[PDB]
């Protein structure tokens, strides 16, 4: 029952690569962020389709290109925070109230393609980079907890990653066609996170030492045959896509194999379904899910939206809805649902923004 | 592949 109620276009006329509703709220009007050009912009959704422009953060570098953003809580205030990053490879932590950049993190050797916050710890930020590595940061103490990468790490750009429900493991994916599992609930990694919270550089002389994780706990190149540019956990299953007009639902190992008994040598995968669509041949096209993971939405390169209902007994039984508008014809780079699932926003290569209300 | 159509 989604209906398109409004649209608009940002003044820079550059691609909007990312959009995220803030779910780290009190509910408080529904706010979302868009990222494109060298800026991030906040909007507030109101009655009768109204999309109210708030305030932007514009990078001082006119050559910066923001690709991705992610929301969390400020653990010192309970107000939200917004992390943004892109081609410069610099993470900026933004106070969304004032749009001030309150701190930034340098380190990645190239562009940052995705940011994700831990599902249970609002201070733990994951970044994935063109430099072939992932990094885990603690934004409360400004520490680098771990770097995931090496010869057995990704061999090309990492494009996407996702924490599982518990925040016990990460699945990453990228241009080397592979999906890789990184467990972060080992005794060593839990101890390193504890140490990151104990670290105060004014109280000690040591720098904070990061964990160097060179080997994934599972890896496969048998799901897709091209760049893998979006991945999400669905319980113990994985949803991932490449630029081959399909989202694949799969799991490591054989059908009855538990995800936590999977060993790094595991050679098998099981495919539980595949959701096909059309005209999504370019890479860097991301799907999103609602808060409950009842729904999945993906835009294609000519402005069509696909929305799958996952509230069915098995993944391959997902029910698909399509959403089209005769004036929406540019590539849709990302979608986002409001926390109450009542609004769906899509953002486009022509800097346009589309609001769909349930 | 291409990033853009």
Numbering used by the authors:
A (entry chain A): 81 to 107, 109 to 439
B (entry chain B): 1239 to 1243
Quote the study's own text.
The polycomb repressive complex 2 (PRC2) is a histone methyltransferase complex that is required for the maintenance of cell identity in all multicellular organisms. Here we provide functional and structural evidence that the vertebrate-specific PRC2 accessory subunit PALI1 emerged through a convergent evolution to mimic JARID2 at the molecular level. Mechanistically, PRC2 methylates PALI1 K1241, which then binds to the PRC2-regulatory subunit EED to allosterically activate PRC2. High-resolution crystal structures revealed that PALI1 mimics the regulatory interactions formed between JARID2 and EED.
PALI1 K1241 is methylated in mouse and human cell lines and is essential for PALI1-induced allosteric activation of PRC2. Indeed, the PALI1-K1241me3 peptide significantly stimulated the HMTase activity of PRC2 towards mononucleosome substrates. The affinity of EED for PALI1-K1241me3 (Kd = 7.49 ± 0.59 µM) is similar to the affinity of EED for the JARID2-K116me3 peptide (Kd = 8.07 ± 0.49 µM). The PALI1-K1241me3 peptide did not lead to the activation of the cage-mutant PRC2, in agreement with an EED-dependent allosteric activation of PRC2. We, therefore, solved the crystal structures of EED76–441 co-crystallised with a PALI1-K1241me3 or PALI1-K1219me3 peptide. The structures indicate that the two tri-methyl-lysine PALI1 peptides (left two panels) bind to EED in a conformation resembling that seen for the JARID2-K116me3 peptide (the third panel). Specifically, in all three cases the tri-methyl-lysine and its adjacent aromatic residue, in the +1 position, adopting the same conformation when binding to EED (marked in dashed shapes). Accordingly, a F1242A mutation in the PALI1-K1241me3 peptide prevents it from binding to EED and from stimulating PRC2. Altogether, these data and structures indicate that PALI1 and JARID2 interact with EED using their tri-methyl-lysine and its adjacent aromatic residue, despite no other sequence similarity and no common ancestor. Of note PALI1-K1241 and the adjacent F1242, but not PALI1-K1214 or PALI1-K1219, are fully conserved across different vertebrate species.
